[PDB]
Scaffold this active site. Structure first.
Site, PDB file in Angstrom:
ATOM      1  N   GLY A 102       0.804  -1.062   0.001  1.00 49.02           N
ATOM      2  CA  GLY A 102      -0.010  -0.050   0.083  1.00 49.02           C
ATOM      3  C   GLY A 102       1.050   1.252   0.072  1.00 49.02           C
ATOM      4  O   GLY A 102       2.041   1.299   0.376  1.00 49.02           O
ATOM      5  N   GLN A 118       5.666   4.268   0.425  1.00 51.49           N
ATOM      6  CA  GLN A 118       6.494   5.328   0.861  1.00 51.49           C
ATOM      7  C   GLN A 118       7.276   5.352   1.931  1.00 51.49           C
ATOM      8  O   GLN A 118       8.623   6.029   2.024  1.00 51.49           O
ATOM      9  CB  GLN A 118       5.428   6.617   0.834  1.00 51.49           C
ATOM     10  CG  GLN A 118       4.720   6.719  -0.251  1.00 51.49           C
ATOM     11  CD  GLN A 118       3.659   8.186  -0.496  1.00 51.49           C
ATOM     12  OE1 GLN A 118       3.667   8.596  -1.366  1.00 51.49           O
ATOM     13  NE2 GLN A 118       3.342   8.254   0.923  1.00 51.49           N
ATOM     14  N   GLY A 145      -7.234   0.214   2.620  1.00 43.13           N
ATOM     15  CA  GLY A 145      -7.807  -0.991   2.019  1.00 43.13           C
ATOM     16  C   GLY A 145      -6.668  -1.993   1.769  1.00 43.13           C
ATOM     17  O   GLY A 145      -7.075  -3.462   1.943  1.00 43.13           O
ATOM     18  N   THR A 172      -8.092  11.204   5.430  1.00 45.11           N
ATOM     19  CA  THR A 172      -9.113  11.631   5.017  1.00 45.11           C
ATOM     20  C   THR A 172     -10.127  10.640   4.775  1.00 45.11           C
ATOM     21  O   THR A 172     -11.183  10.710   3.940  1.00 45.11           O
ATOM     22  CB  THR A 172      -8.818  12.394   3.436  1.00 45.11           C
ATOM     23  OG1 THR A 172      -8.204  11.238   2.616  1.00 45.11           O
ATOM     24  CG2 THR A 172      -8.199  13.584   3.523  1.00 45.11           C
ATOM     25  N   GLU A 181     -11.285   3.877   8.483  1.00 44.50           N
ATOM     26  CA  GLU A 181     -10.049   3.290   9.133  1.00 44.50           C
ATOM     27  C   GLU A 181     -10.224   2.462  10.374  1.00 44.50           C
ATOM     28  O   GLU A 181      -9.473   1.324  10.438  1.00 44.50           O
ATOM     29  CB  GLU A 181      -8.917   4.550   9.407  1.00 44.50           C
ATOM     30  CG  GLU A 181      -8.539   5.149   7.914  1.00 44.50           C
ATOM     31  CD  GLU A 181      -7.495   6.077   8.086  1.00 44.50           C
ATOM     32  OE1 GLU A 181      -7.741   7.021   8.862  1.00 44.50           O
ATOM     33  OE2 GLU A 181      -6.419   5.690   7.474  1.00 44.50           O
ATOM     34  N   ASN A 213       7.733  10.328   7.062  1.00 40.97           N
ATOM     35  CA  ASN A 213       8.324   8.841   6.868  1.00 40.97           C
ATOM     36  C   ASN A 213       9.986   8.741   7.206  1.00 40.97           C
ATOM     37  O   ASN A 213      10.385   7.935   7.755  1.00 40.97           O
ATOM     38  CB  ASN A 213       7.996   8.563   5.467  1.00 40.97           C
ATOM     39  CG  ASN A 213       6.696   8.354   5.197  1.00 40.97           C
ATOM     40  OD1 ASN A 213       5.853   7.904   6.052  1.00 40.97           O
ATOM     41  ND2 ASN A 213       6.240   8.392   3.731  1.00 40.97           N
ATOM     42  N   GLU A 270      14.619 -13.692  17.633  1.00 38.21           N
ATOM     43  CA  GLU A 270      15.196 -13.230  18.772  1.00 38.21           C
ATOM     44  C   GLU A 270      14.155 -12.045  19.179  1.00 38.21           C
ATOM     45  O   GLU A 270      14.233 -11.863  20.433  1.00 38.21           O
ATOM     46  CB  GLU A 270      16.707 -12.607  18.806  1.00 38.21           C
ATOM     47  CG  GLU A 270      17.337 -12.876  19.928  1.00 38.21           C
ATOM     48  CD  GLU A 270      18.896 -12.258  20.216  1.00 38.21           C
ATOM     49  OE1 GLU A 270      19.332 -12.311  19.037  1.00 38.21           O
ATOM     50  OE2 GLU A 270      19.126 -11.844  21.182  1.00 38.21           O
TER      51      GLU A 270
HETATM   52  N1  LIG Z   1       3.028   7.742   7.893  1.00 39.96           N
HETATM   53  C1  LIG Z   1       2.465   7.496   6.685  1.00 39.96           C
HETATM   54  N2  LIG Z   1       1.206   7.156   6.717  1.00 39.96           N
HETATM   55  C2  LIG Z   1       0.610   7.137   5.579  1.00 39.96           C
HETATM   56  C3  LIG Z   1       1.404   7.443   4.424  1.00 39.96           C
HETATM   57  N3  LIG Z   1       0.532   7.104   3.513  1.00 39.96           N
HETATM   58  C4  LIG Z   1      -0.781   6.999   3.776  1.00 39.96           C
HETATM   59  N4  LIG Z   1      -0.525   6.859   5.202  1.00 39.96           N
HETATM   60  C5  LIG Z   1      -1.726   6.703   6.025  1.00 39.96           C
HETATM   61  O1  LIG Z   1      -2.566   5.366   5.571  1.00 39.96           O
HETATM   62  C6  LIG Z   1      -3.625   5.567   5.745  1.00 39.96           C
HETATM   63  C7  LIG Z   1      -4.517   5.304   4.480  1.00 39.96           C
HETATM   64  O2  LIG Z   1      -4.197   4.053   3.841  1.00 39.96           O
HETATM   65  P1  LIG Z   1      -3.266   4.069   2.659  1.00 39.96           P
HETATM   66  O3  LIG Z   1      -1.927   3.589   3.072  1.00 39.96           O
HETATM   67  O4  LIG Z   1      -2.834   5.157   1.848  1.00 39.96           O
HETATM   68  O5  LIG Z   1      -4.222   3.074   1.658  1.00 39.96           O
HETATM   69  P2  LIG Z   1      -3.609   1.866   0.700  1.00 39.96           P
HETATM   70  O6  LIG Z   1      -2.588   0.806   1.553  1.00 39.96           O
HETATM   71  O7  LIG Z   1      -2.661   2.186  -0.457  1.00 39.96           O
HETATM   72  O8  LIG Z   1      -4.880   1.038   0.131  1.00 39.96           O
HETATM   73  P3  LIG Z   1      -5.930   1.600  -0.919  1.00 39.96           P
HETATM   74  O9  LIG Z   1      -7.321   2.032   0.274  1.00 39.96           O
HETATM   75  O10 LIG Z   1      -6.302   0.827  -1.857  1.00 39.96           O
HETATM   76  O11 LIG Z   1      -5.373   2.938  -1.514  1.00 39.96           O
HETATM   77  C8  LIG Z   1      -4.174   6.774   6.333  1.00 39.96           C
HETATM   78  O12 LIG Z   1      -4.065   6.780   7.845  1.00 39.96           O
HETATM   79  C9  LIG Z   1      -2.955   7.650   6.103  1.00 39.96           C
HETATM   80  O13 LIG Z   1      -2.722   8.646   7.096  1.00 39.96           O
HETATM   81  C10 LIG Z   1       2.704   7.839   4.492  1.00 39.96           C
HETATM   82  O14 LIG Z   1       3.297   8.036   3.477  1.00 39.96           O
HETATM   83  N5  LIG Z   1       3.259   7.754   5.640  1.00 39.96           N
HETATM   84  C1  LIG Z   2     -18.095  13.105 -10.697  1.00 45.02           C
HETATM   85  O1  LIG Z   2     -18.760  12.714  -9.450  1.00 45.02           O
HETATM   86  C2  LIG Z   2     -17.624  13.236  -8.334  1.00 45.02           C
HETATM   87  O2  LIG Z   2     -16.961  14.066  -8.438  1.00 45.02           O
HETATM   88  N1  LIG Z   2     -18.193  12.792  -7.185  1.00 45.02           N
HETATM   89  C3  LIG Z   2     -17.363  13.084  -5.915  1.00 45.02           C
HETATM   90  N2  LIG Z   2     -17.518  12.674  -4.570  1.00 45.02           N
HETATM   91  C4  LIG Z   2     -16.754  13.577  -3.925  1.00 45.02           C
HETATM   92  C5  LIG Z   2     -16.294  13.119  -2.299  1.00 45.02           C
HETATM   93  C6  LIG Z   2     -15.597  14.020  -1.863  1.00 45.02           C
HETATM   94  C7  LIG Z   2     -14.695  15.186  -2.679  1.00 45.02           C
HETATM   95  C8  LIG Z   2     -13.445  16.066  -2.046  1.00 45.02           C
HETATM   96  O3  LIG Z   2     -13.203  17.091  -2.716  1.00 45.02           O
HETATM   97  C9  LIG Z   2     -13.023  15.606  -0.716  1.00 45.02           C
HETATM   98  C10 LIG Z   2     -12.514  16.498   0.049  1.00 45.02           C
HETATM   99  C11 LIG Z   2     -11.900  16.312   1.487  1.00 45.02           C
HETATM  100  C12 LIG Z   2     -11.695  15.084   1.828  1.00 45.02           C
HETATM  101  C13 LIG Z   2     -11.870  13.993   0.786  1.00 45.02           C
HETATM  102  C14 LIG Z   2     -12.735  14.276  -0.384  1.00 45.02           C
HETATM  103  C15 LIG Z   2     -14.846  15.179  -3.975  1.00 45.02           C
HETATM  104  C16 LIG Z   2     -15.927  14.188  -4.874  1.00 45.02           C
HETATM  105  N3  LIG Z   2     -16.284  14.071  -6.053  1.00 45.02           N
HETATM  106 CL   LIG Z   3      -8.439  16.503   7.067  1.00 47.38          CL
END
Ligand SMILES: Nc1nc2c(ncn2[C@@H]2O[C@H](COP(=O)(O)OP(=O)(O)OP(=O)(O)O)[C@@H](O)[C@H]2O)c(=O)[nH]1
Ligand SMILES: COC(=O)Nc1nc2ccc(C(=O)c3ccccc3)cc2[nH]1
Ligand SMILES: [Cl-]
Ligand SMILES: Nc1nc2c(ncn2[C@@H]2O[C@H](COP(=O)(O)OP(=O)(O)O)[C@@H](O)[C@H]2O)c(=O)[nH]1
Ligand SMILES: [Cl-]
Ligand SMILES: [Mg+2]
Lengths: 426, 155, 426
Positions: free
Chosen positions: C10, C15, C135, C170, C174, C219, C245
Site C-alpha cells: 500500500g 512510501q 484497504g 481523509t 479506518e 516517513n 530473537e
Molecule cells: N506515515 C505515513 N502514513 C501514511 C502514508 N500514506 C498513507 N498513510 C496513512 O495510511 C492511511 C491510508 O491508507 P493508505 O496506506 O494510503 O491506503 P492503501 O494501503 O494504499 O490502500 P487503498 O485503500 O487501496 O489506497 C491513512 O491513515 C494515512 O494517514 C505515508 O506515506 N506515511
Molecule cells: C463526478 O463525481 C464526483 O466528483 N463525485 C465526488 N464525490 C466526492 C467526495 C469528496 C470530494 C472531495 O473533494 C474531498 C475533500 C476532502 C476530503 C475527501 C474528499 C470530491 C468528490 N467528488
Molecule cells: Cl482533514
C-alpha cells in the site's frame, strides 16, 4: 482513471455544456481541443475527462442524449459545441413533453440502446474505467425518465462501476409546469437504488441565491447555471488536479456514504458571485457551512451531518484552514453525528478556479436533505390525490400503483433520514 | 348519453363540441364516476372559454366530487389564474374544504402559485384554515422555507 | 548469513519503504544504482556486476505510488519485477484488498517473493510494512500474511504498522479496516511495531518545528526508527541478531506481540550546534511519553520486556550507570514473572540522517523497545471508534458488497475484546 460523462435532456445538456466550458478553461483546453495552458499541472489528470486524440487534441469523454433534436443544435452553437465527438450525439425526433413515462418506457426505450452502444465504445477505450457521471433534471421527461432508464441499463452492463449524478430538482419558482413533482418522485426512486452519489442541485435554492443574495431581479437559466458549473468544478477538483487527494470515485463514496440509500448530498460553494461581477479563510469556512450557500434548499441546522467533505482551492495557509475547520466542529459539535468519528474531512488544491484567488466547495451528507424530499412529496401528493394528469402516464403503459410505490418509497427515504437524525451514541 | 360526451369535450377543450352537445340537452352538471362535472374538468385543464360558457348555462360553480374537490380547488392546484378569477366572480366558495381538509389557499400555497395565493387572499381566504394535520397555508410556507410565500401570507 | 525480505504493502508501506531503503543505503555506503566501492548481505543481495540489490518487494493495488519509485532516484536500485502494481485500488475497503481486488494479484506477489527466497541460503523471514487504515495496507496485508504462513510455516514475520490518526487522514472507515486486519493477522504475525501517525505528527511539530508535517516529514522520522530497530539485523550485533530473537526478547506471549518504541534524541536540523546529549540524558528520554511512537502512558502499564538499542559514541559503562538510575524510578513497574532487567545492544556507528531531512546529526542515539500493557490504550481508542460506527452498521454495506460477511465484523471485534482482556490479565 477515466470518467465517462453523460448528459440527457434540455437541462442535462445545458448544465453539462457549462461544466465542459469551465473545466476546459481550468485545464487550458481550446474549443478546438488544443492545449494552450501555462502549467504542467493542467495536464497530469487530463485523461480523467478527456480522450487524447491524434493531433495533440483533447476530446471530452462525454455522451450527449436527448429525445428533442433542438437542444443538440444549441450545444454545437456554443463556444465548445464542436469539441464533442460528433458520433457521441444521440438524439430522437419526437421529444418527451415533460412526461417521465415517455422518457422511461416509450420514446426513451426506443433510443436507450443506441445510447449504450456509444457508452460501450467510450468504455472499451478506457485503461481503467473509474465510473460514470450524469447531468440531468428530475422535473422533465427526458432527463428524468430516460436518464434513470440509462442509469439502470448502465448498472446492468457495468455493475462494478460507480454512478454519480448531478440531478437538478424542480421548483415552482423556476418552471411552472405542475407535473414536475410526478417526474421527480418517480426518478428519485430510481436514484435511491441505482446511484452511488447524487448531487442535489435544487432550482429552489439556485433561484433564492440569485434573487435574494445576488439580488438578480429576474434570474435566467444562465444565472442558475453559473452556480451549477462552479459547484461541479469544485466537486470534481480532487479528481482533475494533483494534490493531497489521490482518491478515485469509489474511495470518495466509501468515506461519504454510511448507508446505501443515503447518498444524496447538499453541495455548497463560497464565494457566491454573479456572472462578471477576496475572502479570508475564516470567511470561507463560515460561508460554506451557511444555509445561504447551499445548492439544496435545506437548512443544515435543522438536521445533522453524517459526513462532510470540503475542498479549498487557492494559495492559503493549510494550518489556518485546519484551525477554522476545527473551530466550526467544536462550536457546532451537536450538528455532527457523534457515532461517525472524524466525519468532517478537508482537502486543498493550490490551483484556484477561474477569476478567484480563493474558493471552497462543500459536500454535505446531511439528514436535513429530507426537507427537499418532503417538499417534493407534498407537491406530489397534492397532485396525486386529485389524480390530475395521470392519463398522460397510464396512457403510456404505466400502472397507477407505480405512483403509490414512488410516493411510498419517497417517504421511507424521509423516514430513514429522520431515524439517523435522532439516533445517539449511548 | 350526452353527459359523458360533454365531460370528455370539456376535458379536451373542444369549445365547439361543447355548445353542440349543450344544444341537444346535454346535462351541464353531468357527473363522471368520481363525481367530477364538466366545470371541474374544464377548470383542471385550463379551458377558460369552456369554463365561462358552462357558468353562463347553469353550471354549479361549487359542485364537489367524491373527494370534496370544487372547481376552484382544481384551478388553484393546477395554477390557472384567469380561471380562478372567473370562478370567484361567479360565486366560488373561496374557503371550500375537501376530504383532506385542504382549501384552495392550501393547494395554491403547496404548488407555489403565488399570484393565485394573492388573489385568494384578496377574496377572503381564511389564513387560519387547518388541513387534517393541523397545517394552515402559513404553516406550509414555514415548514418548506418558502420566504416569498410567507411574506405574501403575512401582508 | 541469514537473509531478511522486506515487503511493502500500500501507499504508506511503499512510501515508508522508500525512506527506509534510502537510509539503509546511506548507512552501508550503497549508491542509488546499487554500486559500492559481510553484514548487510542479510538485506541486500549481490549480483555479478557488484550491484547490491535490496531483498525488497513493493506491492500496491494502484500504480501511482510505486510509479514514482520506478522514476525516482532509486529506479536502478530495486529489482523491477519486485515493484508490483494493479490498476484499481481497495478504495479504503478492507474487503476489497483481501477478497475481491486483492486476490487478483496475490499469486503474482507470492511467485515474485518466491523468486527472492530462492536466492536465500537461510531465510529468516519477512518484514511487512503497511497501514492499518488503507484497504490495501489492511486487506491485502492480512491476505498476504495468511498465505505466507502456509508457504513459509517456519519463518518469522514482523510488522511495521501505521496506526491511523485523524490529523493526516481523509478516511472515516479506518477503525473498521484496523480491527479487521489485526484480527486476521494476529495469529500469523510474530511481532508488530505500531507507528501512531499522531505521535510522529506531534514530534515533527514539537521537536522539529514543522507546523504542517507532510508524509515525507513523517516517513523520514519513521524510517530513522525502523533503521534503529533493524540495525541489529544489518550489522551483526549481539542483541536481536535474527528475527526469532525479537520475539524471545520482546514477546513473552504470541498474542501480546505489540512492543512500544521510543526514540531519542529528535533535534531540528536548524539546531546544528546543540550540545551533545549524554547517554544518561537520551536514556531518560526513553521514558518520557512525548518521545514514543504510540500515544499511551506506560506509567499506567506494566513492562514485560525492555530492550535498549544504542547507536554511536556510547560506552557500555555509561549505559549501566544510566540504567541503574532508571531502576530507581517508581514509574517503571515490571510484571512479577519477568526478569526486571534491560537487554542492551550497542552499535558504535554514528547515527545517519538523510540529506534533505529535518533531523540534526547526533553523536549518540537510542531506541527503546518495550512490551508494556499500556499500549492497550491505543487498542481501546480504535475499538471505541469501531463500536460507535458498527452499532449503527455505518459503512458496513461497502464491505458486505465486496465478498465479506457481516459476521466478520463482530468476530474481529470479539477478538479485539479478548486482546484487551489479555492486557488486563497481565
Ligand atoms: N506515515 C505515513 N502514513 C501514511 C502514508 N500514506 C498513507 N498513510 C496513512 O495510511 C492511511 C491510508 O491508507 P493508505 O496506506 O494510503 O491506503 P492503501 O494501503 O494504499 O490502500 P487503498 O485503500 O487501496 O489506497 C491513512 O491513515 C494515512 O494517514 C505515508 O506515506 N506515511
Ligand atoms: C463526478 O463525481 C464526483 O466528483 N463525485 C465526488 N464525490 C466526492 C467526495 C469528496 C470530494 C472531495 O473533494 C474531498 C475533500 C476532502 C476530503 C475527501 C474528499 C470530491 C468528490 N467528488
Ligand atoms: Cl482533514
Ligand atoms: N438550472 C437549470 N434548470 C433547467 C434548465 N432547463 C430546464 N431546467 C429544469 O428542468 C426541468 C425541466 O426538465 P427539462 O430538462 O427541460 O426536460 P427534458 O429536456 O425532457 O429532460 C424544470 O424543473 C426546469 O426548471 C437549465 O438550463 N438550467
Ligand atoms: Cl539489568
Ligand atoms: Mg492506495
Amino acid at each position: 482513471r477515466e470518467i465517462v460523462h453523460i448528459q440527457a435532456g434540455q437541462c442535462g445538456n445545458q448544465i453539462g455544456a457549462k461544466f465542459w466550458e469551465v473545466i476546459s478553461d481550468e485545464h487550458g483546453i481550446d474549443p478546438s481541443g488544443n492545449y494552450v495552458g501555462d502549467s504542467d499541472l493542467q495536464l497530469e489528470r487530463i485523461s480523467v475527462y478527456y480522450n487524447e486524440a491524434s493531433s495533440h487534441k483533447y476530446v471530452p469523454r462525454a455522451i450527449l442524449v436527448d429525445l428533442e433534436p433542438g437542444t443538440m443544435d444549441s450545444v454545437r452553437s456554443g463556444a465548445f459545441g464542436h469539441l464533442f465527438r460528433p458520433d457521441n450525439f444521440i438524439f430522437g425526433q419526437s421529444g418527451a413533453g415533460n412526461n417521465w413515462a415517455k422518457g422511461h418506457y416509450t420514446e426513451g426505450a426506443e433510443l436507450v440502446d443506441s445510447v449504450l452502444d456509444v457508452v460501450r465504445k467510450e468504455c472499451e477505450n478506457c485503461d481503467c474505467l473509474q465510473g460514470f457521471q450524469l447531468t440531468h433534471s428530475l422535473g422533465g421527461g427526458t432527463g428524468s425518465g430516460m436518464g434513470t432508464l440509462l442509469i439502470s441499463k448502465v448498472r446492468e452492463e457495468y455493475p462494478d462501476r460507480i454512478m454519480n449524478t448531478f440531478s437538478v430538482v424542480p421548483s415552482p419558482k423556476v418552471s411552472d409546469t405542475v407535473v414536475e413533482p410526478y417526474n421527480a418522485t418517480l426518478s428519485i426512486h430510481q436514484l435511491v437504488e441505482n446511484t452511488d452519489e447524487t448531487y442535489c442541485i435544487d432550482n429552489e435554492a439556485l433561484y433564492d441565491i440569485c434573487f435574494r443574495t445576488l439580488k438578480l431581479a429576474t434570474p435566467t437559466y444562465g444565472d442558475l447555471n453559473h452556480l451549477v458549473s462552479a459547484t461541479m468544478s469544485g466537486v470534481t477538483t480532487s479528481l482533475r488536479f494533483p494534490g493531497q487527494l489521490n482518491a478515485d470515485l469509489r474511495k470518495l463514496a466509501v468515506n461519504m456514504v454510511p448507508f446505501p440509500r443515503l447518498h444524496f448530498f447538499m453541495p455548497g460553494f463560497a464565494p457566491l458571485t454573479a456572472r462578471g461581477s477576496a475572502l479570508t479563510v475564516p470567511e470561507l469556512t463560515q460561508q460554506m457551512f451557511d444555509a445561504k450557500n447551499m445548492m439544496a434548499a435545506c437548512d443544515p441546522r435543522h438536521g445533522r451531518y453524517l459526513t462532510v467533505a470540503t475542498v479549498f482551492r487557492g494559495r492559503m495557509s493549510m494550518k489556518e484552514v485546519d484551525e477554522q475547520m476545527l473551530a466550526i466542529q467544536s462550536k457546532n459539535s451537536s450538528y455532527f453525528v457523534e457515532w461517525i468519528p472524524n466525519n468532517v474531512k478537508v482537502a486543498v488544491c493550490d490551483i484556484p478556479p477561474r477569476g478567484l484567488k480563493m474558493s471552497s466547495t462543500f459536500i454535505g451528507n446531511s439528514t436535513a436533505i429530507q426537507e427537499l424530499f418532503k417538499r417534493i412529496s407534498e407537491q406530489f401528493t397534492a397532485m396525486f390525490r386529485r389524480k390530475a394528469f395521470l392519463h398522460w402516464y397510464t396512457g403510456e403503459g404505466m400502472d397507477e400503483m407505480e405512483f403509490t410505490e414512488a410516493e411510498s418509497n419517497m417517504n421511507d427515504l424521509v423516514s430513514e433520514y429522520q431515524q439517523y437524525q435522532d439516533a445517539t451514541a449511548e | 348519453d350526452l353527459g359523458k360526451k360533454l365531460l370528455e369535450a370539456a376535458r379536451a377543450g373542444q369549445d365547439d363540441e361543447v355548445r353542440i352537445l349543450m344544444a341537444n340537452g346535454a346535462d351541464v352538471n353531468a357527473t363522471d364516476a368520481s363525481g367530477l362535472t364538466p366545470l371541474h374538468l374544464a377548470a383542471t385543464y385550463g379551458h377558460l372559454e369552456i369554463v365561462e360558457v358552462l357558468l353562463k348555462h347553469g353550471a354549479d360553480v361549487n359542485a364537489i366530487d367524491i373527494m370534496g374537490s370544487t372547481p376552484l380547488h382544481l384551478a388553484a392546484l393546477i395554477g390557472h389564474l384567469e380561471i380562478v378569477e372567473v370562478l370567484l366572480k361567479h360565486g366560488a366558495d373561496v374557503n371550500a374544504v375537501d376530504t383532506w381538509g385542504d382549501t384552495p389557499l392550501h393547494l395554491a400555497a403547496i404548488m407555489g402559485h403565488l399570484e393565485i395565493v394573492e388573489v385568494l387572499l384578496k377574496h377572503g381566504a381564511d389564513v387560519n384554515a387547518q388541513d387534517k394535520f393541523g397545517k394552515t397555508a402559513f404553516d406550509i410556507s414555514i415548514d418548506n422555507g418558502n420566504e416569498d410565500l410567507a411574506e405574501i401570507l403575512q401582508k | 548469513m541469514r537473509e531478511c525480505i522486506s515487503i511493502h504493502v500500500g501507499q504508506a508501506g511503499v512510501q515508508i519503504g522508500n525512506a527506509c531503503w534510502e537510509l539503509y543505503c546511506l548507512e552501508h555506503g550503497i549508491q542509488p544504482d546499487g554500486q559500492m566501492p559481510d553484514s548487510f548481505n542479510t538485506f541486500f543481495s549481490e549480483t555479478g556486476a557488484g550491484k547490491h540489490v535490496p531483498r525488497a518487494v513493493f506491492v500496491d493495488l494502484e500504480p501511482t505510488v510505486i510509479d514514482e519509485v520506478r522514476t525516482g532516484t532509486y529506479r536502478q536500485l530495486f529489482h523491477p519485477e519486485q515493484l508490483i502494481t494493479g490498476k484499481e485500488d481497495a478504495a479504503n475497503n478492507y474487503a476489497r484488498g483481501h477478497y475481491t481486488i486483492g486476490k487478483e494479484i496475490i499469486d503474482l506477489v507470492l511467485d515474485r517473493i518466491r523468486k527472492l527466497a530462492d536466492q536465500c541460503t537461510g531465510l529468516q523471514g519477512f518484514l511487512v510494512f503497511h497501514s492499518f487504515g488503507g484497504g490495501t495496507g489492511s486487506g491485502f496485508t492480512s491476505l498476504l500474511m495468511e498465505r505466507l504462513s502456509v508457504d513459509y510455516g517456519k519463518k518469522s514475520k514482523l510488522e511495521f504498522s501505521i496506526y491511523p490518526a485523524p490529523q493526516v487522514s481523509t478516511a472515516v472507515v479506518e477503525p473498521y479496516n484496523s480491527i479487521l486486519t489485526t484480527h486476521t493477522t494476529l495469529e500469523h504475525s510474530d511481532c508488530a511495531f505500531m507507528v501512531d501517525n499522531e505521535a510522529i505528527y506531534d514530534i515533527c511539530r514539537r521537536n522539529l518545528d514543522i507546523e504542517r508535517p507532510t508524509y515525507t516529514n513523517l516517513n523520514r522520522l519513521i524510517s530513522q526508527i525502523v533503521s534503529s530497530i533493524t540495525a541489529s539485523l544489518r550489522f551483526d550485533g549481539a542483541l536481536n541478531v535474527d528475527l526469532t530473537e525479537f520475539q524471545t526478547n520482546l514477546v513473552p506471549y504470541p498474542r501480546i506481540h505489540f512492543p512500544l518504541a521510543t526514540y531519542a534524541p529528535v533535534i531540528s536540523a536548524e539546531k546544528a550546534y546543540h550540545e551533545q546529549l549524554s547517554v544518561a540524558e537520551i536514556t531518560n528520554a526513553c521514558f518520557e511519553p512525548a518521545n514514543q511512537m504510540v500515544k499511551c502512558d506506560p506509567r499506567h502499564g506494566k513492562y514485560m520486556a525492555c530492550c535498549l538499542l544504542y547507536r554511536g559514541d556510547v560506552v557500555p559503562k555509561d549505559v549501566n550507570a544510566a540504567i541503574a538510575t532508571i531502576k530507581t524510578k517508581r514509574s517503571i513497574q515490571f510484571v512479577d514473572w519477568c526478569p526486571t532487567g534491560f537487554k542492551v545492544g550497542i552499535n558504535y556507528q554514528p547515527p545517519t540522517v538523510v540529506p534533505g531531512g529535518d533531523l540534526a546529526k547526533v553523536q549518540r542515539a537510542v531506541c527503546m523497545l518495550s512490551n508494556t500493557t499500556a499500549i492497550a490504550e491505543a487498542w481501546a481508542r480504535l475499538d471505541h471508534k469501531f463500536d460507535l460506527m458498527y452499532a449503527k452498521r455505518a459503512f458496513v454495506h461497502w464491505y458486505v458488497g465486496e465478498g465479506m460477511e457481516e459476521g466478520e465484523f463482530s468476530e474481529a471485534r470479539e477478538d479485539m475484546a479478548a486482546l484487551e482482556k489479555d492486557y488486563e490479565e497481565v
